[PDB]
C-alpha cells in the first residue's frame, strides 16, 4: 500500500536492529510532513491535522508562534522531543518508547495521517 504505510516509526524501524537512532527519527519528520499534506505547502494546520490534534494542541507543536507547523518544524520539533520520548538514557528509541506505548508524545511530531485505506 505504500503512501499510506510511510507512517510511523514502524517506517524507518521496520529493521529493529535495535531502535531509531536520531538519523531515522529525521527519516520519519520528512516522511510524515510529505503524507500530512493535501494543501500542499508541508506547513500543517486544522485541516492538516484534521481530527488528529485540537485546535490549541496545534499551537503546543510549534516554536515561533505560528500557531501552526512547517517542513522545518515536523523536522525539529519530533527532534526537539526525541529524547524526552524515552523515559531515561541518551539518544535511541524502540517501538516500545515510541509507537503510542511510552513515546505517545513523539507521535504527534512524526505519526502525521491520510485521507484514505
Ligand atoms: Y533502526
Ligand atoms: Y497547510
Ligand atoms: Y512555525
Given at each position: 500500500p505504500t503512501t499510506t504505510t510511510k507512517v510511523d516509526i514502524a517506517a524507518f524501524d521496520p529493521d529493529k536492529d535495535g531502535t531509531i537512532d536520531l538519523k531515522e527519527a529525521l527519516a520519519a519528520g520528512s516522511a510524515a510532513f510529505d503524507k500530512l499534506?493535501?494543501?500542499?505547502?508541508?506547513?500543517?494546520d486544522a485541516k492538516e491535522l484534521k481530527g488528529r490534534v485540537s485546535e490549541a494542541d496545534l499551537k503546543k507543536l510549534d516554536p515561533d508562534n505560528d500557531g501552526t507547523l512547517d517542513k522545518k518544524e515536523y523536522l525539529a520539533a519530533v527532534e526537539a522531543q526525541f529524547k524526552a520520548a524515552n523515559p531515561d538514557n541518551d539518544g535511541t528509541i524502540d517501538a516500545r518508547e515510541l509507537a503510542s506505548p511510552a513515546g505517545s508524545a513523539l507521535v504527534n511530531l512524526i505519526r502525521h495521517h491520510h485521507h484514505h485505506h
Open positions: 499534506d493535501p494543501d500542499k505547502d508541508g506547513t500543517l
